[PDB]
């Protein structure tokens, strides 16, 4: 590692292990960066030697991977936990962690009521969540002009192989209603995967 | 991995073959001589014949095969 | 020689060096550790407090440290880190003195002189609170509890600790309600809300099966008699060369025991604590099956722990052979109770048991052991802080800021001592100010500002005022909602006053061979 | 001035996001405040001239990674 | 466990194997022919015009060659032929494109060119097929 | 056993059950499924791979609607919501000063990594991604509004902000309010250890 070598046990006693953590922290999030977004590259990843996996999902990547540090460890949970949430935000949560844990300690070390420092990274989430609750500015399937038609049409524009999104804007409208199953909190939303869908050559 | 290719690769081959054959110039006809071959049996094998010599004891070569 | 000189310094080397990174103390500070051990491992470690107990440090001055940590727990229930955070505080001052060249035994009693007046300055900053008072008991435990892993259940946990004490406590002023008196008994299932405060003796043992006696008129006692039978306690002449000889003793074995367990229930036994001793059997598996037919609570080879509480609380005595009937020296028990809550756990409750006026048994329940242990550890510091109030009446601060309050003072006290020790004690008298920064220390970058000013802040807060370590800002730490009974902190000096002074004694080294 | 470059400068950022008149550090007083009414007073031209040279050499030398020398 | 590789370094390692594999068999494939002769550690000679026969008999490098055996199979899986074509053909586009294009800096149109270079085949073939 | 009788309990009730073989595939098409409402959308394509092609294009027209039907409140997917929030939260840090101008700004500066990396993942010249978004993001527009007086959107398969405000490749407020805290967590998550030691 770095600095003092005098004690084993992953005790580098401060900034060394802290940096050896930010190193490990900046080490793990790297695959995610190249894998971030659908434009994230697709990683063929050797499982043993000839055993491999081709995956652009960092969480899936992480799951094959092992954690060689608490820095390596604490992210591979929260990333797979945000993966455990949905799978939207897997790569998202990963990266920003590596930056903030050289950011977090620097303030919370100085104590002076040591409790509330990282809440500066929390109240920001609140501050963000509020604003994040405020954004219909982009991404509206809540209502479009044709609503779920155009919402799916622009979504069939979001995934578009052709002029599909003409009937296929309507199918997705047909699809959500094709499925009728008990959904809770009162949802007329019904699961979109179970939709009976057939392929015709 | 480790790959010998093209012009320089065939050299060792033609170096072996031409290098391996020139010893048999001691053979083929009465002015040539029987060539002594020995094995792990220690048997002195006197043949001006190529085959006898060739298939018993030799130096490792890709051309030797 | 140089060895006595160096080994002390080498003892001063290791122990001090450990006690420093031993201070991230408390806080959400410093980055989490796996530990690859001395002989190797990967040990994921957290919370230096347990880490202190976990700590294996092996070196002549390292071993006293793990001790030093564990003592303040059993001394207080708190301050486990705090005894070590002032340990390296003492370990520094010695150097400058030995660097000044001052004699270590002259340095030695300086620790006493530091411990002697130090506790009084602590006694001065001690805000005395009633040890039998529900509120002081509630409030002091509440500060621990609100800082414990359950601050919610703390509301239910504190009155339990308050009532656990006040039952067990000697009336009015008392140094009482030990952690030996209190018997903390886990119960699988239930809830933390269902954590139960029982005044009496509840033995945590798992009662045989269920549907057994929950009824009244128990007789519980540790019985060292065994149930005889053929091929159990009773003689046989028959070697088995055949299958029938194998079966014959068994047919007489289970029947005779079946009539022995009657004598047990005939004794009035709704419980027995079976001797851990056996011959071939003692109480057999069918025997217990037969005792439980008669609703005798049995746990085969009962844990040695519940053996003692029933002898400690009830005063249980050895009992005569069941063919001799009994001495009725089974302890006095009016209830054999097996509680099942969350449908989980088998818990013997002996209530109406002979009790001194002490031995509360807090029954700790939860949907999980982890659920169980949260409050269990929390109610412990609810017990201990109150127990610390009981053992010593005061509310001081927690967190170690009042150490600086002793520090400004004890400096001058040395300056008044006007001895060579006035240099010895004073060198530490200020050196005790180190902790509040070293709590904070182990996390981040851009370090310096808070560290020096902390001791400065309190120094500018002078003797009466200072900065709260937990809550921040300058306000007298003794009463904050950062508080401790003074018993917590004074023992930290005591423990460290000595084990550190014990190093001053070491000349050279030996190894018993 | 005995301050926290970490903590203080943001306070003055804050006190230029809250104040913003002169609010700034006094090494003299060892505090932070409006320096003009903390009376710390210098012409702006030197500061103008500070700017002029500030970016100047800055933008200047960064235009040279391509450097030539001829001790010969 | 966790391992990270990056940039040209692997993609150059991608360039190497398949391209180096693409050498002898391109000379082998077609009426103009050669032989790829594996040297066994004992001196054992194995000469074929199928590199995938030779590739297996010795270490298959991970970055290019592990996928090339399978795209060797896939072609021979499908039509029943063509292990020796796809490898040199993929070795072609693998060779000169990325570094050059990554020195022109983008992964995107590189990948996108494969498409529109692929259909021009489909386009000009079936016209002159 | 096939010897079993049949009773009408296993009979489905419909206006009519009529056999329509279409595509040279006969299906059982139940007209008026009575005990619930039912539909199935068959996909006409050149081949079933061509049908595999649009079917998957349909699925991210689905979950987005679903995730919207899950939460009416949403965001544009990607770190573009940061690009607004970040400088805003760095501003939201500014007047805080002291510790607090650091954290919330040291927070919001660490946000920027996600989309820009995602940008260059699309080779979008991450300078562009910030140039477009946080330009529109202002004090002029601090405003997500419900609408665009600024563009807070980022298309993920594009890596570049586009004009799609309905697109199915975005994400609602659901996964994004989560990813924030988990990100704040790892700042804390490693920090709980008190003291330090070593074992033998």
Coordinates of N, CA and C in Angstrom, one line a residue, chain E residues 1-118:
Chain E
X1 N -11.7 -12.4 -9.2 CA -12.1 -11.2 -8.5 C -12.2 -10.0 -9.4
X2 N -12.1 -8.8 -8.7 CA -12.2 -7.6 -9.5 C -10.9 -7.4 -10.3
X3 N -11.0 -7.2 -11.6 CA -9.8 -6.9 -12.4 C -10.3 -5.9 -13.5
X4 N -9.4 -5.0 -13.8 CA -9.6 -3.9 -14.8 C -8.6 -3.9 -15.8
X5 N -9.0 -3.8 -17.1 CA -8.1 -3.6 -18.2 C -8.7 -2.4 -19.0
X6 N -7.8 -1.8 -19.8 CA -8.2 -0.5 -20.4 C -7.7 -0.2 -21.8
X7 N -8.4 0.6 -22.5 CA -7.9 1.3 -23.7 C -7.4 0.5 -24.8
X8 N -6.5 1.1 -25.6 CA -5.8 0.5 -26.7 C -5.2 -0.8 -26.3
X9 N -4.7 -0.9 -25.0 CA -3.9 -2.0 -24.5 C -4.5 -3.3 -24.8
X10 N -5.8 -3.5 -24.4 CA -6.5 -4.7 -24.7 C -6.9 -4.8 -26.2
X11 N -7.3 -3.6 -26.7 CA -7.8 -3.6 -28.1 C -6.6 -3.8 -29.1
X12 N -5.4 -3.4 -28.7 CA -4.2 -3.8 -29.4 C -4.0 -5.3 -29.2
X13 N -4.1 -5.8 -28.0 CA -4.1 -7.2 -27.8 C -5.2 -7.9 -28.6
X14 N -6.3 -7.2 -28.8 CA -7.3 -7.7 -29.7 C -6.8 -7.7 -31.1
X15 N -6.1 -6.6 -31.5 CA -5.5 -6.5 -32.9 C -4.6 -7.7 -33.1
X16 N -3.7 -8.0 -32.1 CA -2.6 -8.9 -32.3 C -3.1 -10.3 -32.8
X17 N -3.8 -11.0 -31.9 CA -4.0 -12.4 -32.1 C -4.7 -12.7 -33.4
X18 N -5.9 -12.3 -33.5 CA -6.7 -12.6 -34.7 C -5.9 -12.2 -36.0
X19 N -5.3 -11.0 -36.0 CA -4.5 -10.6 -37.1 C -3.4 -11.5 -37.4
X20 N -2.6 -11.8 -36.3 CA -1.5 -12.8 -36.5 C -2.1 -14.1 -36.9
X21 N -3.2 -14.5 -36.4 CA -3.9 -15.7 -36.9 C -4.3 -15.5 -38.3
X22 N -4.6 -14.3 -38.7 CA -5.1 -14.1 -40.1 C -4.0 -14.2 -41.1
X23 N -2.8 -14.4 -40.7 CA -1.7 -14.4 -41.6 C -1.6 -15.6 -42.5
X24 N -1.2 -16.7 -41.9 CA -0.9 -18.0 -42.6 C -2.2 -18.4 -43.4
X25 N -3.3 -18.4 -42.7 CA -4.5 -19.0 -43.3 C -5.0 -18.2 -44.5
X26 N -4.9 -16.9 -44.5 CA -5.2 -16.1 -45.7 C -4.3 -16.6 -46.9
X27 N -3.1 -16.8 -46.6 CA -2.2 -17.5 -47.6 C -2.7 -18.9 -47.9
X28 N -3.1 -19.6 -46.9 CA -3.7 -21.0 -47.1 C -5.0 -21.0 -47.8
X29 N -5.9 -20.2 -47.4 CA -7.3 -20.1 -48.0 C -7.2 -19.8 -49.5
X30 N -8.1 -20.4 -50.3 CA -8.1 -20.2 -51.7 C -7.1 -21.1 -52.4
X31 N -7.2 -21.2 -53.7 CA -6.3 -22.0 -54.5 C -4.8 -21.7 -54.2
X32 N -4.4 -20.5 -54.1 CA -3.1 -20.1 -53.5 C -3.1 -20.5 -52.1
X33 N -2.1 -21.3 -51.7 CA -2.2 -22.1 -50.4 C -0.8 -22.1 -49.8
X34 N -0.9 -22.3 -48.5 CA 0.3 -22.6 -47.6 C -0.2 -23.6 -46.5
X35 N 0.7 -23.8 -45.5 CA 0.3 -24.6 -44.4 C 0.8 -24.0 -43.1
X36 N -0.1 -24.0 -42.1 CA 0.2 -23.5 -40.7 C 0.6 -24.8 -40.0
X37 N 1.9 -24.9 -39.7 CA 2.5 -26.1 -39.0 C 2.7 -25.8 -37.5
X38 N 1.9 -26.3 -36.6 CA 2.2 -26.2 -35.2 C 3.4 -27.0 -34.8
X39 N 4.2 -26.5 -34.0 CA 5.3 -27.2 -33.4 C 4.9 -27.7 -32.0
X40 N 4.7 -29.0 -31.8 CA 4.5 -29.5 -30.5 C 5.8 -29.4 -29.7
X41 N 5.7 -29.3 -28.4 CA 6.9 -29.2 -27.6 C 7.9 -30.3 -27.8
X42 N 7.4 -31.5 -28.3 CA 8.3 -32.6 -28.6 C 8.8 -32.5 -30.0
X43 N 8.5 -31.4 -30.8 CA 8.9 -31.3 -32.2 C 7.8 -31.8 -33.1
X44 N 6.6 -32.2 -32.5 CA 5.5 -32.7 -33.3 C 5.0 -31.6 -34.2
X45 N 4.9 -31.9 -35.5 CA 4.5 -31.0 -36.5 C 3.0 -31.3 -36.9
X46 N 2.2 -30.2 -36.9 CA 0.8 -30.3 -37.3 C 0.6 -29.2 -38.3
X47 N 0.5 -29.6 -39.6 CA 0.3 -28.5 -40.6 C -1.1 -28.7 -41.3
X48 N -1.9 -27.6 -41.2 CA -3.2 -27.6 -41.8 C -3.3 -26.2 -42.5
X49 N -4.4 -26.1 -43.2 CA -4.9 -24.8 -43.7 C -6.0 -24.2 -42.8
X50 N -6.4 -25.0 -41.7 CA -7.3 -24.5 -40.7 C -6.5 -24.1 -39.5
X51 N -6.5 -22.8 -39.3 CA -5.8 -22.3 -38.1 C -6.5 -22.7 -36.8
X52 N -7.9 -22.8 -36.9 CA -8.7 -23.2 -35.7 C -8.3 -24.6 -35.3
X53 N -7.9 -25.4 -36.2 CA -7.3 -26.7 -35.8 C -6.0 -26.5 -35.1
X54 N -5.1 -25.6 -35.5 CA -3.9 -25.3 -34.9 C -4.1 -24.5 -33.6
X55 N -5.0 -23.5 -33.6 CA -5.2 -22.7 -32.5 C -5.6 -23.5 -31.2
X56 N -6.4 -24.5 -31.4 CA -6.8 -25.3 -30.2 C -5.6 -26.1 -29.6
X57 N -4.8 -26.6 -30.5 CA -3.7 -27.5 -30.1 C -2.7 -26.8 -29.2
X58 N -2.8 -25.5 -29.1 CA -1.8 -24.7 -28.3 C -2.7 -23.7 -27.5
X59 N -2.0 -22.8 -26.8 CA -2.8 -21.8 -26.0 C -3.6 -20.9 -27.0
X60 N -4.9 -20.7 -26.6 CA -5.7 -19.7 -27.3 C -5.7 -18.4 -26.4
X61 N -5.1 -17.4 -27.0 CA -5.1 -16.1 -26.3 C -6.5 -15.6 -26.1
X62 N -6.7 -15.0 -24.9 CA -8.1 -14.5 -24.6 C -8.6 -13.4 -25.5
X63 N -7.9 -12.3 -25.7 CA -8.6 -11.1 -26.2 C -9.2 -11.2 -27.6
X64 N -8.4 -11.6 -28.6 CA -9.0 -11.8 -29.9 C -9.3 -13.3 -30.1
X65 N -8.5 -14.2 -29.7 CA -8.5 -15.6 -30.3 C -9.6 -16.4 -29.6
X66 N -10.0 -16.0 -28.4 CA -11.1 -16.7 -27.7 C -12.4 -16.5 -28.4
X67 N -12.6 -15.3 -28.9 CA -13.9 -15.1 -29.7 C -13.7 -15.5 -31.1
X68 N -12.5 -15.6 -31.7 CA -12.4 -16.0 -33.1 C -12.7 -17.5 -33.4
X69 N -12.3 -18.4 -32.4 CA -12.7 -19.8 -32.6 C -14.2 -19.9 -32.7
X70 N -14.9 -19.1 -31.9 CA -16.3 -19.2 -31.9 C -17.0 -18.6 -33.1
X71 N -16.4 -17.5 -33.6 CA -16.8 -16.9 -34.9 C -16.3 -17.8 -36.0
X72 N -15.2 -18.5 -35.8 CA -14.8 -19.6 -36.7 C -15.9 -20.7 -36.7
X73 N -16.3 -21.2 -35.5 CA -17.4 -22.2 -35.5 C -18.6 -21.6 -36.1
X74 N -19.1 -20.5 -35.6 CA -20.4 -19.9 -36.0 C -20.6 -20.0 -37.5
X75 N -19.5 -19.5 -38.3 CA -19.6 -19.6 -39.7 C -19.7 -21.0 -40.2
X76 N -18.8 -21.9 -39.6 CA -18.9 -23.3 -40.0 C -20.1 -24.0 -39.4
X77 N -20.6 -23.4 -38.2 CA -21.9 -23.9 -37.7 C -23.0 -23.7 -38.6
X78 N -23.0 -22.5 -39.3 CA -24.2 -22.1 -40.1 C -24.2 -22.8 -41.4
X79 N -23.3 -22.5 -42.3 CA -23.3 -23.0 -43.7 C -22.6 -24.3 -43.8
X80 N -21.7 -24.6 -42.8 CA -20.9 -25.8 -42.9 C -19.5 -25.5 -43.5
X81 N -19.1 -24.2 -43.5 CA -17.8 -23.8 -44.1 C -17.4 -22.4 -43.5
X82 N -16.2 -22.0 -43.7 CA -15.8 -20.7 -43.5 C -15.1 -20.3 -42.2
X83 N -14.6 -21.3 -41.5 CA -13.8 -21.0 -40.3 C -12.6 -20.1 -40.7
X84 N -12.0 -20.3 -41.9 CA -10.8 -19.7 -42.3 C -11.0 -18.3 -42.9
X85 N -12.2 -18.0 -43.4 CA -12.5 -16.7 -44.0 C -12.8 -15.7 -42.9
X86 N -13.8 -15.9 -42.1 CA -14.2 -14.9 -41.1 C -13.0 -14.4 -40.3
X87 N -12.2 -15.3 -39.9 CA -11.0 -14.9 -39.0 C -10.1 -13.9 -39.7
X88 N -9.8 -14.1 -41.0 CA -8.9 -13.2 -41.7 C -9.7 -12.0 -42.0
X89 N -11.0 -12.1 -42.3 CA -11.8 -11.0 -42.6 C -12.0 -10.1 -41.4
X90 N -12.4 -10.7 -40.3 CA -12.4 -9.9 -39.0 C -11.1 -9.4 -38.7
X91 N -10.0 -10.1 -38.9 CA -8.6 -9.7 -38.7 C -8.3 -8.4 -39.6
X92 N -8.8 -8.4 -40.8 CA -8.7 -7.2 -41.6 C -9.3 -6.0 -41.0
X93 N -10.6 -5.9 -40.8 CA -11.2 -4.8 -40.1 C -10.7 -4.5 -38.8
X94 N -10.3 -5.6 -38.0 CA -9.7 -5.4 -36.7 C -8.3 -4.6 -36.9
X95 N -7.5 -5.0 -37.8 CA -6.2 -4.5 -38.0 C -6.2 -3.0 -38.1
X96 N -6.6 -2.4 -39.2 CA -6.3 -1.1 -39.5 C -7.2 -0.1 -38.9
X97 N -8.4 -0.5 -38.5 CA -9.5 0.4 -38.2 C -9.2 1.2 -36.9
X98 N -9.3 0.5 -35.7 CA -9.5 1.2 -34.5 C -8.4 2.2 -34.2
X99 N -7.2 1.7 -34.0 CA -6.1 2.7 -33.6 C -6.1 3.9 -34.5
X100 N -6.0 3.7 -35.8 CA -6.2 4.8 -36.8 C -7.4 5.6 -36.4
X101 N -8.6 5.0 -36.4 CA -9.8 5.6 -36.1 C -9.8 6.1 -34.6
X102 N -9.2 5.4 -33.7 CA -9.1 5.9 -32.3 C -8.1 7.0 -32.2
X103 N -7.1 7.0 -33.1 CA -6.3 8.2 -33.3 C -7.0 9.4 -33.9
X104 N -8.0 9.0 -34.7 CA -9.1 9.9 -35.1 C -10.2 10.0 -34.0
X105 N -10.1 9.1 -33.0 CA -10.8 9.2 -31.8 C -12.4 9.1 -31.9
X106 N -12.8 7.8 -32.0 CA -14.2 7.5 -31.7 C -14.4 6.0 -31.8
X107 N -15.1 5.4 -30.7 CA -15.5 4.0 -30.9 C -16.7 3.9 -31.7
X108 N -17.5 5.0 -31.9 CA -18.8 4.9 -32.4 C -18.9 4.5 -33.9
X109 N -18.5 5.4 -34.8 CA -18.7 5.2 -36.2 C -17.9 3.9 -36.6
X110 N -16.8 3.7 -35.9 CA -16.1 2.4 -36.1 C -17.1 1.2 -36.0
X111 N -17.8 1.1 -34.9 CA -18.9 0.1 -34.8 C -19.9 0.3 -35.8
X112 N -20.3 1.6 -36.0 CA -21.3 1.9 -37.0 C -20.9 1.6 -38.4
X113 N -19.6 1.7 -38.7 CA -19.1 1.4 -40.1 C -19.3 0.0 -40.4
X114 N -19.1 -0.9 -39.4 CA -19.3 -2.4 -39.7 C -20.7 -2.6 -40.3
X115 N -21.7 -2.0 -39.7 CA -23.1 -2.0 -40.3 C -23.0 -1.6 -41.7
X116 N -22.7 -0.4 -42.0 CA -22.8 0.2 -43.3 C -21.8 -0.3 -44.3
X117 N -20.7 -0.8 -43.8 CA -19.8 -1.6 -44.6 C -20.3 -3.0 -44.9
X118 N -21.1 -3.5 -43.9 CA -21.6 -4.8 -44.1 C -22.7 -4.9 -45.2

